[PDB]
Design a protein around this ligand. Structure first.
Ligand code: MG
Ligand code: MG
Ligand code: MG
Ligand code: MG
Lengths: 53, 84, 105, 160, 128
RNA sequence: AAGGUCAUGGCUUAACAAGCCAAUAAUUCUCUUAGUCGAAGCUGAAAAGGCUGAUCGACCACAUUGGGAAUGAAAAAAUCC
RNA sequence: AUAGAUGAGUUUGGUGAUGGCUCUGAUUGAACACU
């Protein structure tokens, strides 16, 4: 019983009055932590070689 | 073990103690050879093992053979394409 | 009935680096991680431990990253066994003698 | 690591002491976790990932940040809007508790005691206005959000 | 100074990673478990910053300086006894990093055999 | 490799290898002091609090000092030499 | 166990600090003096 009660609370939904009152944070900033490789990493590297030469 | 147990131990069995040290002397001898062989490969912390390429620094790869002297003039790697 | 088979149990898996090799046969020193808690300062300190691991086929080289498992008693000081190589050192894995599975050992 | 959170705490103190309307922070998931909790607690006004220059002040929420890739990850920064009410900063003090030299962890019963203003462990009881942020497996939470979810974890800093 | 900057061109031409990728048989370190080789962008210029080049450049400076401290009146130069110690400790750190980073790659052995760098140069403590 | 073991371990033995632990004192030695511990006693608002180590319980040691063995299921004696 | 956290005298021509000392609280397998 002590385990179910504690596990239920840690995975409970936020309060409604907390949802309809808290300001908005764009998901582009609050969830985009992953940093992928530059898709143009190969094109840029080929242009940087020409400019450096 | 303490020093009292040392003398006491070797006093009980004088002969058995002697045999134990004869075998230890064999490994202490073999271990001294491997050290002298590893210290040689250790080298110098500044020079290590002077190679013909390191010797070519003195002339910037322009000399074909190292200076003599005892020593012997050995060929060195060169970079004749480099200018000033 | 009269056959006393080994336990054949699987213990935890630790990742570490091989510190020494070739000095003794079928044995290498592996450095693993750890952390001991100081109760007076109330903090953790790095507590790395170096064990002697069992290399049956002599397939490990110094500087190699391997995964070891305890509970495999082979000698007085050897209670760990190599599970598999994470990152080889010097030569590829396929160019070394294979590591037997725990079932084979 | 915890050193970045310690730099984020002392920097926000200096930005509020200087009465700056904006302030930048290094762009890391750890700093973003604490900033979201400060914003969720109402201590800061905004959070926006951007470049080395602050976005347009008026169009701050509708700002369109470019995707973060390896070609610009080195120049990204988190821009924080600071609050000042009644000629006083809303984020006056940010005192860290767990430091690089020692990570202080609290249990659920210690947080229950610190929430009502009673010392427990290396922490002290909370008074009127003070807040405490704990880094738990459920994210960076406020001590009263942690005891509600019944979890402990690493104590980050006490916000006066 | 003319030979100093001419030697720097020799180190970049000999140990330059842009040249050893094709000169050596197995320059890169052996792959790990599960890791597979993927193509990466080409270099926009010569390799002048790899640990091999830096360790080679430091070797040329250590010789030019250690050879001047051993010459006539070299013992009277007390200030540059720190410079030699500072060059050996800078090379010790790069050798100590490249040792674990390269995991015994053919590119690591080429540097040692060519420059004559023995374990004494990075293993323990350099006391001068 | 063999023996031993409920089993494990140079635990034991033969033959080989030169290792293993440590490098900031592992190891060893000298001097000074002390029986150890407990919400057992006293004390502080409190700290892995401080102090003590009476009466109580647990443990260690001793029986004028030093040097020893046997008996016995077991030394665990104010025994014995 | 959620009530539990306190001071005072004393350096200086004077002021603010620093820093000890002493007193205020509780106690003893206590001793001594007067009872
Ligand atoms: Mg650490
Ligand atoms: Mg002079
Ligand atoms: Mg005594
Ligand atoms: Mg005066």
């Amino acid at each position: 019983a002590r385990y179910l009660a504690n596990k239920r609370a840690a995975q409970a939904p936020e309060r409604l009055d907390e949802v309809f009152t808290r300001a908005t944070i764009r998901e582009s900033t609050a969830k985009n932590t992953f940093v992928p490789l530059d898709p143009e990493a190969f094109v840029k590297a080929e242009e940087a070689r020409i400019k450096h030469a | 073990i303490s020093q009292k147990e040392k003398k006491r131990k070797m006093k009980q069995d004088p002969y058995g103690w002697a045999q134990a040290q004869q075998r230890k002397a064999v490994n202490v001898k073999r271990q001294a050879e491997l050290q002298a062989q590893r210290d040689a490969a250790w080298g110098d912390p500044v020079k290590g093992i002077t190679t013909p390429f390191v010797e070519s620094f003195d002339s910037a790869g322009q000399a074909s053979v190292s200076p003599p002297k005892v020593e012997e003039p050995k060929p060195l790697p060169t970079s004749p394409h480099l200018r000033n | 009935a009269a056959a006393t088979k080994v336990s054949r149990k699987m213990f935890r898996e630790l990742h570490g680096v091989v510190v020494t090799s070739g000095l003794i046969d079928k044995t290498v020193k592996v450095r693993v991680g750890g952390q001991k808690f100081n109760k007076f300062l109330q903090k953790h300190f790095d507590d790395p431990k170096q064990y002697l691991v069992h290399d049956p086929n002599n397939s490990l080289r110094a500087g190699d990253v391997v995964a070891i498992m305890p509970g495999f008693i082979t000698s007085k000081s050897k209670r760990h066994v190599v599970k598999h190589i994470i990152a080889p050192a010097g030569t590829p894995i396929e160019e070394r003698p294979p590591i037997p599975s725990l079932d084979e050992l | 690591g915890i050193q970045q959170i310690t730099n984020m705490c002392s920097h926000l103190q200096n930005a509020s002491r200087a009465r700056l309307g904006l302030t930048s922070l290094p762009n890391t998931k750890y700093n973003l976790a604490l900033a979201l909790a400060l914003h969720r607690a109402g201590f800061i006004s905004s959070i926006t990932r951007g470049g080395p220059h602050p976005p347009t002040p008026e169009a701050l929420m509708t700002y369109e940040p470019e995707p973060v890739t390896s070609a610009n990850v080195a120049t990204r920064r988190l821009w924080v809007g600071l609050k000042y009410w009644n000629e006083e900063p809303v984020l006056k003090e940010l005192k860290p508790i767990s430091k690089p030299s020692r990570l202080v962890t609290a249990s659920l019963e210690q947080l229950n005691r610190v929430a009502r203003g009673f010392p427990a462990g290396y922490m002290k009881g909370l008074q009127l206005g003070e807040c405490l942020f704990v880094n738990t497996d459920r994210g960076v939470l406020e001590v009263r959000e942690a005891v509600e979810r019944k979890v402990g974890g690493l104590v980050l800093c006490k916000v006066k | 100074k003319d030979r100093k900057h001419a030697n720097i061109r020799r180190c970049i031409e000999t140990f330059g990673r842009h040249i050893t990728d094709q000169s050596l048989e197995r320059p890169t370190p052996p792959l790990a478990r599960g890791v597979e080789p993927k193509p990466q962008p080409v270099r926009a210029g010569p390799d002048t910053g790899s640990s091999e080049v830096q360790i080679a450049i430091l070797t040329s400076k250590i010789r030019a300086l250690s050879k001047a401290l051993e010459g006539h009146g070299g013992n009277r130069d007390k200030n540059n006894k720190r410079s030699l110690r500072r060059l050996c400790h800078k090379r010790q750190r790069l050798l100590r990093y490249m040792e674990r980073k390269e995991r015994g790659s053919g590119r690591w052995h080429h540097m040692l055999e060519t420059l004559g760098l023995t374990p004494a140069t990075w293993k323990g403590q350099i006391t001068l």
